[PDB]
């Protein structure tokens, strides 16, 4: 059992209840510190692309700790090298947000928390045949982090919810765990075009929920996409699972981890990318 809000099973306890691997020293999230990071001009623009002959349905579930969009197999991919040859295949996208607008993200950028951080989770299909083979194996995963920020004046079509197609209206108080519903597909290419896909932090870290496996290649884009207060409050209408002390889902984020805890046996480095100038 784990939770965010029950002090007994909360994130401070994960290093004990899930020693493998929540006690490790390559954990996530971290503070993404622009001044400490190393600019690496070899890190290219990220591309997200779709298999246009895929027809299966997309679904979303309230799994008790987030809203998680589950994509069909063989449908959405990420390329980090400009070639569209299916090296990373997207599995799911879920979200982390706050009870209030000034927190919610798991990563910080120079100490700053955003209201909502989305995680697009993919597996390295280049090496592994399926999500379930990759999820617990070395180097199996790569996650994209997308920061969202609230604006007062904006057309719907300009907000991230256009790419999400409003999650087909499923974000409301009656979307109780562990219900899942079919939704219109998420246009992840459009979502990525709402920010600068060349401008990101990059490091090796972990899943941010138990068992915190250290096999995640992280990419966190620096520019946020935009949403309204109305849209953030939609997520806040979801109920938490019954493991949680709080009724309404919010503050479902793990606290910050150090880039290099004192016990590390080989330091990791935080890299940054920017467009070819």
Ligand X SMILES: CC(=O)N[C@@H]1[C@@H](O)[C@H](O)[C@@H](CO)O[C@H]1O
CB 115 to ligand X: min, Å: 18
Residue 275's nearest CA partner among 50, 43, 62 is: 43
CB 228 to Zn ion: min, Å: 22
CB 80 to Zn ion: min, Å: 19
Which part of the chain contacts Zn ion (CB under 5 A), choosing from 25-33, 114-122, 229-237, 251-259? 114-122
Rounded to whole angstroms, how far apart are CA atoms 185 and 73? 13
Among 119, 124, 125, 272, binds Zn ion (CB under 5 A): 119
Nearer to ligand X, 181 or 264 (CB): 181
User: Which residues, including other chains, have CB under 8 Å from residue 34's CB and lie 6 or more apart?
Assistant: 109, 110, 272
CB 8 to ligand X: min, Å: 39
For residue 187, state whether it binds ligand X (rule: CB under 6 A).
no
Angstrom CA distances, 134 to 63, 124, 125, 140, 143, stand at 21, 7, 8, 4, 13
The 3-state secondary structure of 104-140, one letter per residue: CCCCEECCECCCEEEEEEEEECCCCCCHHHHCCCCCC
Residue 96's nearest CA partner among 85, 107, 86 is: 107
Among 59, 63, 79, 166, binds ligand X (CB under 6 A): 166
Active-site annotation holds for 15: no
Among 20, 34, 57, 74, binds ligand X (CB under 6 A): 74
Please, is 248 exposed, middle or buried when counting C-beta atoms within 10 Å of its C-beta (0-12, 13-18, 19+)? middle
Residues 27-66 close enough to bind ligand X by CB under 6 A? 51, 53-54
Binding track over 101-140 against ligand X, x by CB under 6 A: ----------------------------------------
51 binds, among Zn ion, ligand X, none (CB under 5 to 8 A by kind): ligand X
Is the link from the previous residue into 178 a cis peptide, with omega within 30 of 0? yes
Rounded to whole angstroms, how far apart are CA atoms 194 and 252? 24
CB 196 to Zn ion: min, Å: 21
For residue 86, state whether it binds ligand X (rule: CB under 6 A).
yes
Nearer to ligand X, 53 or 242 (CB): 53
- Give the number of other CB atoms < 10 A from CB of residue 167: 22
Nearer to ligand X, 73 or 268 (CB): 73
For residue 165, state whether it binds ligand X (rule: CB under 6 A).
yes
Structural contact between residues 184 and 165, judged by C-beta atoms closer than 8 angstroms? yes
For residue 228, state whether it binds ligand X (rule: CB under 6 A).
no
The site for Zn ion (CB under 5 A) is made up of 119
| Residues tagged active-site | 65
The site for ligand X (CB under 6 A) is made up of 51, 53-54, 74, 86, 156, 165-166
């Amino acid at each position: 059992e784990w939770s965010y809000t029950n002090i007994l099973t909360g994130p401070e306890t994960w290093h004990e209840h899930y020693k493998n691997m929540c006690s490790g020293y390559y954990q996530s999230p971290i503070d993404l510190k622009t001044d400490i990071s190393t600019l690496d001009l070899k890190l290219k623009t990220v591309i997200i692309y779709r298999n246009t002959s895929s027809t299966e349905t997309t679904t979303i579930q309230n799994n008790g700790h987030s809203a998680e969009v589950k994509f069909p197999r063989n449908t959405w991919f990420i390329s980090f090298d400009g070639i569209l040859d299916y090296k990373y295949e997207i599995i799911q996208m879920h979200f982390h947000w706050g009870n209030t607008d000034d927190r919610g993200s798991e990563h910080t950028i120079d100490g700053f928390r955003f209201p909502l951080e989305g995680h697009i989770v993919s597996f390295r299909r280049q090496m592994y045949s399926s999500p379930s083979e990759a999820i617990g194996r070395p180097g199996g995963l790569a996650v994209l982090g997308i920061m969202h920020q609230i604006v007062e004046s904006i057309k719907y079509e300009q907000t991230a919810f256009k790419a999400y197609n409003n999650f087909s209206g499923v974000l409301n108080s009656q979307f109780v765990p562990p219900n899942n519903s079919t939704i219109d597909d998420i246009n992840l290419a459009l979502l990525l075009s709402l920010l600068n896909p060349s401008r990101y932090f990059r490091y090796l870290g972990s899943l941010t929920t138990p068992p915190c496996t250290e096999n995640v290649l992280w990419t966190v884009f620096i520019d946020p996409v935009l949403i309204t207060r109305e849209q953030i409050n939609l997520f806040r209408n979801l109920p938490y699972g019954s493991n949680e002390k709080q009724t309404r889902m919010g503050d479902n984020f793990r606290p910050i981890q150090l880039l290099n805890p004192i016990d590390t046996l080989a330091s990791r480095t935080l890299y940054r990318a920017t467009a070819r100038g």
